[PDB]
Design a protein around this ligand. Structure first.
Ligand code: SF4
Ligand code: F3S
Lengths: 58, 457, 284, 402
């Protein structure tokens, strides 16, 4: 359950900042939606789910 | 019971429960000798001098380093990834060997943890030191501010690295710390001085070992081991993508995410093995660290060495197979060019060192394996160096081609991190319980040169 | 299919509102001598001594190249390479093609930061100091640049100049930036960098933001050769080599040069979409 | 011993007839059509190729594991070795069929591979392709056949002697065969790794001579190794439910369930890293590989991610569920289907492109080889008793629990 909390944190953070607050272009990366440019968020989303799953149960 | 007669004893000397605790507690319960002080002094001096070099270059400029307008990275990130590679050994020994029910890991786990907490920390210095304006480093974090809530992007692997390293360390710190609770309990119960009494009553929590407490303890360690293996892989992979995701010929690839990991395992165990070899003689714990532990370390190194070898020929095949001249030239530059000696000395070490382990007469030798274990770390330093430098001084547009040579302040900082490593590790060995008691006492009856002999008759 | 048609991503709309380009033709490039000093006149690029340039660590925003040849032609350095064998001759031909033969041919090439569209220098900046505009520049903020030196590496053209010391007021650099009487050349419209921040041959923002300004207060449309006369990368060269201006305006000097049989970018197989195109050397 | 069901025979016969008939059916049905007609003619051919390589590698995914378990001195595997030996009886037959197909390509009976076509190498032809011709030092046909051929011997020989020496160990008063096999298996694993890398280049990446990538072979390895493990589990579940296994319990099942779970995650890891490293920096050369897959094989491409990751992710994480027969069987089926799709996805866009579909000629080849596989494996189980004799680790494996 702590891991599930973590993924909601990671995805609501990045989907807010990157595509709903400043949708600027950094490279040719399509920041139109959250499906588009999704892969670049995976390295962070993963780490957050482990982080919360680990520390909140310890 | 049902144990197979094929297996050899992991505990030597017919030792009981008191024998084990006395042996391990003894170095904690007594004074350090003159030799310890000599070595300590040396490591400390190297560290302090290194700090001076760090302060100097931060306060006067990165231009004091041997960096070029072409080669923006060299020795700074080279040493960063080198230390990161070292700090994956302990998280393999305590998590992966756990998952594969490898009993022999019980005599290593505790010192293996020390190897990561004192090496990830060293790596953590380079992400700051090389920065142009490090006093503004706090801008890396997505914190609400007076710039109209100005944020960070989430597309750069440099940011991914921040999350990877900071959470890797954080998780591993609570993991190994929890494992100390039943061992600090065995030191607070000695209380030879009121000072030490207080110290261990604070270091340990209220750990009165009970049925329920142990039940939960076991379950927590199983969960964390399960989470730890993914971290071992994903953290080093995020580091790997600093080069894999580029457009530079010689860096852009898909092999790095598993390739660098295999190298990390290889170099990590080579490091660990040299400390265990000297440890079992200085601390007199050779009855716990046996030749079977040493041999098994050698076997694992051999295996991962061959994986790396396959990746080397994979890259060369693909380079030939590919019709891209820029990729082929990059490999020609490594084979023949101004840095040929870095490339070929690197290849010599990584190709031949792990192949000596096929010979039992070489594998089962603490003398030979000590030497080889040292050699591996040299080759791996060049592995990181060669990839970064040889791919930057030669690339698109011949007019931009250059060289590279480091300065004494590049060298000095590296020396400083080595000195600091040993200051921390050396102090550790005189204050912490080097072998987990809760772990060893669960295998003393299952294996050892007493009970096996009893089973045989 | 033409390499420029392959793209997993989606493009951005820059079809309206002043898409810029910049045009070199290699025949008019005689030496392009005075084009350098005029670009270092507004932009306050500091002067570095003999040492710190001896270590190849200088500060220049645009550069002129120099390419000799082996065996008297440039086509003679394309017959030795296409005819090659396996791994025994290719270790000797590539070591002989860096020794220039007697009486070769010389070729010049001006190289600056062509403001890419799929720019590799953008996506990896962790502190987000670089971005693109609707006009098509590469905007470089001197504020979030906390100098983690990535973006000097992913530029394949590699025109990106990090500064290393403080060049402003210290006694190690006793040039015109130091003394009080000689700090009048410096224009007040462009800031002066201090330490740890990178700089780059931007398009002439501090002029084209004033040309749009002086055409907006009046109530007019910008003229034909009005963008070309303000950017001193083009408005100070002797010949008609450098041509700056607008593209969406279909009556400028750039829009008649972009529709040519000599249309040509550097490194189209990289797939970075540059905004500066060279033509062809048409020697005989 | 193992008594044959006396029902699976006719069952497998039905599969080997209906599938065979469907295969036969599949072959009975300016410059635009010069493209299209080749896409259409390749449909019943690649429908067979993908089926053969799927089951061929399925068998290899068991031998790799088999060798590992013996080299690693596992204390729970001995009781399952006879089943694994029975499964790896397909390989010496399936490899014959697969090899024949490779020969048929060489003899120009199809247009499965591009570089095997005529007029590609010579400059005096409208079919001349300089890029392919420049790779002919590796793609030269007689070299390709010999190189492929010796990989099959390198796998079949191991299989043969592993069984032979095991049976010898069962009828001896000392060891010597155990240690013999220990040494052999170690040698095999070294060979295997090398032959694996080359194999992928020759049998899978050879479908597109204009594309390359590092980390391809390791991806391929994971895509069949995982499925190999699930086939082991499913056979032991069947035999156990029929009363033919002893000293087998939920801890043996559980151990296999968590094993296959972990490695299925590993497959996903490799899949993503290959994709993302191309997507992130889309240098147009070598990018069309994904362009033509995403735009055409949309659901196949992404469905393969879900079935091989998302489904088992929420199943085989509960240790109680890992001991349930129907949970394990269910997950095993999904995984097998997912990896079939993985091979389908890799091959199809290069042979038929947008003319792909999953109708009669695809189903028919699946059922044909399914029946063949079943027939061979269960027949093999009648030629040797389950639960080997004196073995240095069998006594502890018979009391294994977790
Ligand atoms: S040319 Fe170099 S600086 Fe200019 S946009 Fe492309 S990568 Fe960035
Ligand atoms: S990547 Fe960013 S922090 Fe400065 S060095 Fe380049 S603009």
């Amino acid at each position: 359950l702590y891991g599930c909390v973590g993924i909601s944190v990671a995805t609501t953070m990045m989907s807010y900042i990157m595509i709903h607050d400043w949708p600027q272009d950094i490279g040719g990366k399509p920041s139109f939606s959250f499906i588009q440019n999704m892969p670049s968020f995976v390295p962070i989303m993963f780490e957050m789910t482990v982080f919360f799953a680990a520390h909140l149960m310890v | 019971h049902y144990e197979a007669p094929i297996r050899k004893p992991l505990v030597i000397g017919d030792k009981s429960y008191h024998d084990v605790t006395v042996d391990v507690a003894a170095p904690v319960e007594g004074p350090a000798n003159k030799q310890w002080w000599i070595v300590f002094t040396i490591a400390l001096v190297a560290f302090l001098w290194g700090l001076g070099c760090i302060i100097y270059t931060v306060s006067t400029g990165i231009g004091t380093w041997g960096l070029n307008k072409t080669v923006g990275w060299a020795w700074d990130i080279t040493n960063f990834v080198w230390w990161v590679g070292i700090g994956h050994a302990g998280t393999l020994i305590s998590a992966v060997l756990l998952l594969f029910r490898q009993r022999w890991r019980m005599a290593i786990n505790r010192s293996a943890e020390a190897m990561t907490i004192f090496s990830v920390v060293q790596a953590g210095l380079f992400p700051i030191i090389h920065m142009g304006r490090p006093w503004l480093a706090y801008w890396v974090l997505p914190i609400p501010n007076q710039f109209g809530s100005l944020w960070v992007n989430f597309n750069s692997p440099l940011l991914w690295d921040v999350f990877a390293i900071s959470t890797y360390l954080s998780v591993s710190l609570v993991f190994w710390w929890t494992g100390l609770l039943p061992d600090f309990a065995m030191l607070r119960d000695r209380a030879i001085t009121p000072f030490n009494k207080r110290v261990y009553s604070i270091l340990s929590f209220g750990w009165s070992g009970r049925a329920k407490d142990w039940q939960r303890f076991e379950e927590v360690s199983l969960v964390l081991a399960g989470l730890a293996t993914p971290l071992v892989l994903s953290v080093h992979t995020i580091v790997s993508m600093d080069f894999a995701t580029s457009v530079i010929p010689g860096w852009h690839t898909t092999i790095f995410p598993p390739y660098f990991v295999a190298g990390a395992v290889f170099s990590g165990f080579a490091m660990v093995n040299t400390l265990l070899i000297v440890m079992r003689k200085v601390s007199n714990l050779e009855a716990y660290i046996t030749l079977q532990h040493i041999e098994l370390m050698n076997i694992i190194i051999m295996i991962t060495g061959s994986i790396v070898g396959v990746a080397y020929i994979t890259e060369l095949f693909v380079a030939w197979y590919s019709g891209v001249e820029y990729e082929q030239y990059a490999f020609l530059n490594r084979a023949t060019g101004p840095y040929w000696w870095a490339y070929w000395s690197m290849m010599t070490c990584n190709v031949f060192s792990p192949q000596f382990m096929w010979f039992k007469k070489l594998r089962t030798s603490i003398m030979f394996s000590f030497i080889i274990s040292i050699v591996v770390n040299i080759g791996m330093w060049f592995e990181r160096f060669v990839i970064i430098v040889t791919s930057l001084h030669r690339d698109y547009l011949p007019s931009s081609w250059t060289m590279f040579s480091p300065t004494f302040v590049d060298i000095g900082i590296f020396i400083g991190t080595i000195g600091f490593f040993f200051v921390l590790f050396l102090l550790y060995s005189r204050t912490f319980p080097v072998i987990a008691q809760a772990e060893v006492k669960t295998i003393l009856k299952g294996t050892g040169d007493n009970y096996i002999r009893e089973r045989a008759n | 299919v033409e390499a420029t048609t392959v793209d997993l991503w989606e493009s951005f709309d820059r079809t309206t509102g002043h898409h810029f380009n910049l045009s070199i033709d290699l025949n008019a490039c005689t030496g392009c001598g005075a084009c350098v000093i005029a670009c270092h006149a507004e932009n306050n690029v500091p002067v570095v001594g003999k040492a710190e340039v001896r270590r190849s660590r200088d500060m220049h925003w645009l550069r002129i190249d120099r390419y000799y040849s082996s065996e008297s032609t440039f086509e003679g350095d394309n017959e030795r390479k296409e005819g090659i064998a396996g791994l025994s001759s290719s270790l000797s031909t590539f070591n002989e093609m860096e020794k220039p033969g007697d009486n070769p041919q010389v070729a010049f090439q001006p190289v600056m930061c062509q403001h890419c569209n799929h720019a590799p220098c953008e996506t990896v900046c962790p502190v987000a100091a670089t971005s693109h505009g609707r006009q098509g520049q590469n905007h470089m903020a001197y504020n979030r640049c906390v100098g983690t030196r990535y973006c000097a590496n992913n530029c394949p053209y590699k025109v990106r100049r990090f500064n290393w010391f403080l060049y402003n007021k210290n006694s190690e650099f006793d040039y015109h930036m130091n003394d009080d009487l000689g700090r009048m050349v410096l224009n007040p419209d462009v800031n002066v960098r201090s330490r740890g921040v990178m700089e780059k041959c931007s398009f002439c923002i501090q002029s084209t933001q004033a040309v749009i300004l002086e055409a907006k207060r009046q109530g007019r449309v910008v003229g034909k050769d009005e963008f070309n006369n303000a950017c001193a990368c083009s408005a100070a060269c002797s010949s008609g080599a450098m041509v700056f201006g607008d593209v969406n305006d279909k009556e400028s000097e750039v829009a008649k040069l972009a529709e040519s049989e000599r249309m040509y970018h550097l490194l189209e197989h990289v797939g970075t979409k540059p905004n500066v195109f060279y033509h062809v050397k048409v020697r005989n | 011993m193992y008594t044959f069901s006396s029902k699976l025979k006719t069952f497998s016969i039905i599969l080997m007839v209906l599938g065979l008939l469907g295969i036969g059916y599949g072959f009975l049905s300016t410059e635009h059509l010069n493209h299209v007609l080749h896409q259409l003619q390749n449909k019943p051919w690649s429908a067979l190729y993908v089926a053969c390589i799927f089951f061929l590698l399925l068998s290899m995914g068991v031998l790799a594991f088999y060798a590992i378990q013996q080299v690693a001195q596992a204390g729970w595997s001995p009781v399952l070795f006879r089943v694994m030996q029975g499964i790896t009886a397909y390989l010496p037959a399936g490899s014959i069929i697969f090899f024949i197909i490779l020969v048929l390509c060489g003899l120009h009976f199809n247009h499965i591979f591009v570089w095997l076509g005529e007029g590609v190498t010579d400059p005096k032809s409208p079919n001349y392709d300089a890029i392919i011709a420049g790779k002919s030092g590796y793609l030269n046909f007689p070299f390709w056949i010999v190189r492929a051929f010796i990989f099959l011997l390198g796998w079949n020989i191991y299989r043969h002697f592993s069984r032979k020496n095991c049976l010898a160990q069962d009828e001896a008063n000392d060891d010597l065969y155990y240690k013999k096999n220990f040494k052999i298996s170690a040698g095999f694993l070294v060979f295997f790794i090398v032959s694996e890398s080359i194999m992928a280049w020759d049998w899978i990446m050879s479908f597109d001579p204009h594309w390359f990538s590092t980390l391809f072979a390791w991806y391929v390895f994971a895509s069949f190794f995982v499925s190999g493990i699930t086939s082991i589990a499913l056979i032991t579940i069947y035999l156990k439910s029929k009363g033919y296994l002893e000293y087998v319990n939920t801890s043996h099942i559980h151990d296999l369930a968590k094993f296959m779970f972990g490695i299925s995650v590993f497959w996903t890891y490799l899949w993503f890293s290959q994709f993302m490293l191309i997507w992130y920096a889309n240098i147009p050369e070598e990018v069309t590989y994904f362009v033509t897959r995403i735009q055409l094989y949309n659901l196949p491409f992404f469905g393969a991610v879900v079935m091989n990751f998302v489904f088992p992710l929420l199943i085989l994480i509960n240790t109680d569920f890992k001991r349930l027969n129907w949970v394990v069987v269910m997950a095993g089926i999904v995984i097998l289907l997912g990896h079939y799709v993985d091979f389908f996805n890799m091959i199809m866009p290069g042979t038929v492109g947008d003319k792909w579909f999953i109708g009669v000629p695809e189903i028919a080849s699946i059922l044909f080889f399914l029946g063949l596989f079943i027939f061979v494996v269960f027949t093999a189980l009648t030629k040797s008793p389950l639960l080997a004799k004196r073995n240095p680790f069998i006594e502890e494996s018979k009391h294994f629990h977790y």
